[model samples]
Target: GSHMRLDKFIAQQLGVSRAIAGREIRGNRVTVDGEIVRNAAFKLLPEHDVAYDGNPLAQQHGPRYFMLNKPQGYVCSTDDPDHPTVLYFLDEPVAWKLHAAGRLDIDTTGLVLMTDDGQWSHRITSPRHHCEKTYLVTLESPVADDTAEQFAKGVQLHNEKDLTKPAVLEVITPTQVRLTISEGRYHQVKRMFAAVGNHVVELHRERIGGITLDADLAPGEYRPLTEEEIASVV
Candidate 1:
């Protein structure tokens, strides 16, 4: 191959989504052959070494994993300074330069994993990975008939061309619901309800990759994974 778009190459090798790969490119975050290239479509020869800003891509190192029960109001990141970040929950030695598999915005609570392990992290975070995320969603009202049916079938979210993949929407009484989806998009849970002309009154991500938050763990609390828990990521 002569050259391919930077975003497409990164996406193929790392398993990150096209959209996010584009962001990493446009944010002036990646370079080729030591030349900063901000266009996602920029082409590169295999001979050029790639880096993100000044650091080489995370693929250069061995992968690792962290099981995190992210709480409300904590942004799932190691870089943001505007609010509490997921890194704060780590006990330090493990915190350095690690990143969450994907982001859970501030105010969403539940299982958010972190790691420096690029391929492992990429596998979970990759949009194409289709990692199931389960949520305990409290609706503002008892779900309407059309809305419930639409959710079960599929509901289109903002800026997307089509409806979602069929999702499991189990009703827990009128106001509470358990929704399981193998998709995560920006404001996904909230936006799905929006597509059905409703809103998510409260949203809590209870699980990611089949791992649930421990009941014994209080809000804003964390613990090292049991050997069993650690084994799941691999």
Candidate 2:
């Protein structure tokens, strides 16, 4: 191992595919005996101990993506210095630089996206691209017929920061509506529902871009997103 590419060495040692191994190497988690290594092709010596911040690597063979059924009360934040964050589900002493592409509030639940790829996250989340986000909403009471129309036509959600754009709406049921929006603001969906004289008792993200949430994965559990799912984001 005296002159091997850092990624190749880690892939062989960890019994994971090579491509995924390179992502881990580039993620700033691998250190060659206390010194952080960045370059994938950096030479390493087997005699010099290699460590993974004391966490195991489960790199998938192909490009990585994920769709999560975030349960209520779990915030969609990365490792926060103040509170128990979503990263808690991920094995402790986290060895990967993973982050949620967008956020779902602490009290809200449904689909949440996470990834290690910076550019990919940016492309999906950027407001300029106008990626569509779909949500299934359960209102406290049946909504007024005109309410859906009003919300879809765009509400002047009062904000000193920025006014929200008009939303695209679809009525799935008397009390349930499927809302699609080009932007995500702080409590955008909840606010939109409120603006039209309705109370959103429960909400779940069902789609983003074209990727729909899988019903099988229970709340608080997650799985990698497929390349096709990733494509819908960008």
Candidate 3:
């Protein structure tokens, strides 16, 4: 941000209290374009090369985006008393700022988009976008042959008067299936199977929109999304 106060900048960058930021500034730990800026109220220009104890502050640009291979047992939320949250795996500055773009159940594992950019994520999570997600599902029983065609026509979900959006289901094995759906309804995959008298045993997401989960990433691991992956979202 341009013309920001030194204390405010550090307080925001380091996620510290104003008193802590002011102490650092007054201690001459803050520099503006290589000159020590001791005045907490000193104004910093857009061209200023701000640094904290020789480490340059990253320019305030657009928010960050990432993709994570989430492991089971960690909730997608930022805070949870019973189980660990996904942010535990991200050792990022102000980790609280990052959030899962689309939530996954604690029992579900695999590709999860993490980002601090709200509008960008909205393009994926917003129902209006109709972004498609693919999942590999393990079921308790053999899927009936007609189930795939039934899913393509949309199934009647319990409690909802409206039929679910049509989904594509491909049987991988008697008890395994690969399903693609454009909607992210609550417990949708499992519920869809249940509607057809089948039970979902395991669920793992494999792709979102045009981006696939990186094969190099193990469960709970994450990395920054490449420019192509980021821009793939409409």
Maximum-lDDT candidate: 3
Q: Residues 25-116, candidate 2: write the lDDT tens digits.
A: 88987987678887788876645567786554333332346778888767766545555677666652332567788888777777888777
Least well predicted 10-residue stretch by lDDT in candidate 2 = 55-64
lDDT winner, 1 or 2: 1
- 2 or 3, which is superior by lDDT? 3
Which regions of candidate 2 fall more than 4 Å away from where they truly are?
A: 1-63, 78-83, 92-96, 160-163
Q: Per-residue lDDT of 103-153 in model 3, one digit per residue for the tens?
A: 999999999999989889888899777899999999999999999989989
Q: What do the candidate models score in CA lDDT, each in turn?
A: 0.75, 0.74, 0.89
Q: After superposition, which runs of candidate 1 have C-alpha atoms over 4 Å from their true positions? A: 1-64, 78-80
* C-alpha TM-score for every candidate: 0.67, 0.68, 0.76
Best TM-score goes to which candidate? 3
Q: Return the clash pairs for model 1, or none.
A: 73-107
Q: Native-vs-model 3 lDDT?
A: 0.89
Worst 10 residues of 1 by lDDT: 57-66
- Global fold similarity of model 3 (TM-score): 0.76
lDDT of 1 at 102: 69
lDDT (Cα, tens digit) per residue for candidate 1, span 101-132:
76888887777766776776777778777788
